[PDB]
Design a binder for this molecule. Structure first.
Ligand SMILES: *Cc1c(COP(=O)(O)O)cnc(C)c1O
Ligand SMILES: *Cc1c(COP(=O)(O)O)cnc(C)c1O
Lengths: 388, 76, 388, 76
């Protein structure tokens, strides 16, 4: 068992050997390297077929129709596309948008740009557990509200929103609902034939597909529309121009198909390892759980260690690959939203599990955390204070 | 004729590239040597459905182009 | 020698076995799969190094500084970024933009969107050979002009513009000059330390790198600025947010390094094959050359065959993989700009050469074209007319 | 000391991520075991240049952080 131990599957995951192998068949002179936009020869046509086989693979995971799937360069793009695309298309119905103060930066930074463009954006504070108050969401909705973006699973604390119910509130009022499902896709079940989501973002590299590819769900029925953000020939049914990257696209679709298969088995296994982990450390004195144990992603666990200087916490767990969620001095904007102070936020670690994670690694982790938080506290002027 | 197709793909009201997408998917869930009646009103299908059979190696059986809806019978 | 014979390197090229092999070292659990944005562990840091080694490789091809190179998902994105980014940033100096009526769709469609946003765009007609009249360009420039986009090498006819001189005209007036160099990068020499280009686009898959990656040059000195189009965390020095796709990025940089090396040798070889090709067909009766023989890319040859029904021309050269440049019934918008009628434009073929192209393939091509244009004309009511 | 560096990287006026980029490139065109005086005024370099030496496995020699410009002597 090698070190570091990767516990940062939420930052990015490694590409499946099965995925990477497919992606090899679409690269070199003897593979299917042709441009799926060339239709005067065989090269293009068979490439386009590869694209279509993957577009379906993706669709089937989330109960969509392939004609509802738009190819992008990543979840970041899907979020820009979805939000600015919808906001611009529907701007005549009103200019008000609502989102959550704990959304990923792609959503937050996108909304802030729209605020420059003349849009009004309400950023709702979450409760201490991370869930949005639906009645606070309702009190925000107006006549001139046109769009709501609230993510399925949060990538820092793992907390799951009630996207079904939010979807119902949106539809009943004619408001477009966008959902960032980067973290939830292939982890929690998703069926858009039932869900009242209009736009949904997802990527590949959080599910053992390659970085640099992702997609955007756009509801066919009832019809949702968006303005393209990427111009030049009108590909993807006018919504995202540019050469389609076949291999990238193939790798993503294969990853989504494996995900459909292995999902159930895998998320019950991770959900167990997650519970193995929190139990071997929940007994330590000043440790808090950020998020929800029952109704949180099976693979994310974000815990706070109190009365320890956080700068050195990470230097103490160098045997682990994790993240605190801080930004090139200052501290997770999500934990600060949850309400914790800067010092506590700074000494929080997010453990994120995945395909290659074992019990051996979890147990080693459990041990390391006790002995580490133990040593730091020994030498902590802060702990001695608490020990009064 | 256009009487005993085992499969019937209605693609009316669909516009390029949607028809080739729908047809593409159908041939996959099809057994090699099967019939497929395509009903389209997308004029681009006069070029694109023969193009499919040509570049994807299928059997373009009987055609219709001289009036809407167009009909295209295809075999895998 | 297999068939079809690929003569569509300008649509897309196959990925170099050397490139694809590097891209393998950055995928799976045992490679460098880490997110170059994670800096709390080794995974991220070494990934970021890979990115930096490639960013430099790219820079050195075009005489830029690595700090001037911005990663994008493709040439299409670079063109959107460059044009809307510059136009929006400098809009207080004026709202007028100038480009050429034969630019790639990424540039044209982008300008048309800006026209919706309140920008004024002049689309200059080219001369019959494809070159822009610099004095017509000068007559268009105004006080309130802020940006000019004219491509280095055209992708349909291969014609090269005087980007140096255009750059001088721009600088002297404080106008931002953007250059689409997708076709020229690694084909003609480029040195931005000397050239007065402010923004320059390029991709990877036109130089034996992978589809789905590309970059944008942004001049450091004198300082040019743009508004980001892709929000979410402010990566690439605030100009293009989103996870960097390492393998994609590595494959591109390797492709740009091979290009620096092999360029000279290769473009003298292609320039010879190009001349082999036009000579074995220039003797046919009604054939015209679109573009320039002396001052055109070494690897593109676009020829028109008169008095032949074009629909069947391609069906006649099924042994070749080329393109006419038509759009899912109607005919190359570039050839129509050059001035040719729709029938002639329809029966034009663009032959584009590359790394895997031989003399055997060229000669076979020469032969096929004579015998083909011969048979079509035999059965052409149009030729019999011309034969009066 | 800060007297006999064989290489001198001026990074004044540069801001993260530019310093780590410049330093990154310099160590490549450097021979294993060479000195490099980094002159920076980017405060983020107090975290990032030690982070470089730590995660890229180089020798952080002598430091300066208590006043601008900061100085960082490094060895491959
Ligand atoms: C990682 C992540 C993204 C970013 O996706 P990219 O493919 O890296 O651009 C967006 N949203 C969420 C919730 C994420 O976790
Ligand atoms: C092919 C091409 C593009 C498109 O680049 P992509 O990477 O496919 O998005 C842009 N400009 C020119 C001139 C091209 O030839």
């Amino acid at each position: 068992m090698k070190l570091p131990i990767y516990l940062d599957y939420s930052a990015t995951t490694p590409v499946d050997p099965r995925v990477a192998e497919k992606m090899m068949q679409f690269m070199t002179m003897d593979g299917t390297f042709g441009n799926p936009a060339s239709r005067s020869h065989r090269f293009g046509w068979q490439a386009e077929e590869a694209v279509d086989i993957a577009r379906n693979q993706i669709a089937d995971l989330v109960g969509a129709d392939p004609r509802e799937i738009v190819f992008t360069s990543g979840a970041t793009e899907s979020d820009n596309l979805a939000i600015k695309g919808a906001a611009n298309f529907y701007q005549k119905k009103g200019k008000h948008i609502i989102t959550s103060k704990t959304e990923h930066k792609a959503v937050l930074d996108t909304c802030r740009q729209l605020e420059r463009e003349g849009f009004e954006v309400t950023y709702l504070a979450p409760q201490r557990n991370g869930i949005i108050d639906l009645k606070e969401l309702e009190a925000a909705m107006r006549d001139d509200t046109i769009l709501v973006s609230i993510m399925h699973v949060n990538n820092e604390i793992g907390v799951v929103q009630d996207i079904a119910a939010i979807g119902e509130m949106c539809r009943a009022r004619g408001i477009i609902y966008h959902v960032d499902a980067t973290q939830s896709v292939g982890k929690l079940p998703i069926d858009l034939s039932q869900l009242k989501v209009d736009l949904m973002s997802f990527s590949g590299h959080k599910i053992y597909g390659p970085k640099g590819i992702g997609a955007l769900y756009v509801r066919r029925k009832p019809r949702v529309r968006i303005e393209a953000q990427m111009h030049g020939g009108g590909h993807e049914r006018g919504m995202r121009s540019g050469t389609l990257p076949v291999h990238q696209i193939v790798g993503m679709g294969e990853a989504y198909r494996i995900a459909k298969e292995e999902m159930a088995t895998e998320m019950e296994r991770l959900r167990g390892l997650r519970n193995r982990l929190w139990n071997g450390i929940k007994d330590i004195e000043e440790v808090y759980l950020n998020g929800d144990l029952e109704h949180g992603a099976p693979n994310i666990l974000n815990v706070s260690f109190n009365y320890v200087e956080g700068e050195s916490l990470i230097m103490a767990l160098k045997d682990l690959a994790v993240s605190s969620g801080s930004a090139c001095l200052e501290p997770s904007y999500v934990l600060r939203a949850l309400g914790l102070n800067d010092e506590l936020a700074h000494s929080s670690i997010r453990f994120s599990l995945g395909r290659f994670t074992t019990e051996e690694e979890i147990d080693y982790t459990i041990e390391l955390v006790r002995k580490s938080i133990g040593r730091l506290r020994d030498l902590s002027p802060l702990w001695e204070m608490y020990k009064q | 004729l256009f009487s005993s197709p085992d499969h019937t793909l209605d693609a009316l009201g669909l516009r390029c590239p949607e028809p080739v997408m729908m047809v593409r998917k159908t041939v996959r869930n099809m057994q090699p040597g099967e019939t497929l009646l395509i009903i389209a009103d997308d004029p681009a299908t006069t070029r694109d459905i023969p193009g499919f059979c040509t570049f994807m190696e299928h059997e373009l059986v009987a055609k219709e182009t001289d009036g809407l809806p167009y009909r295209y019978l295809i075999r895998k």
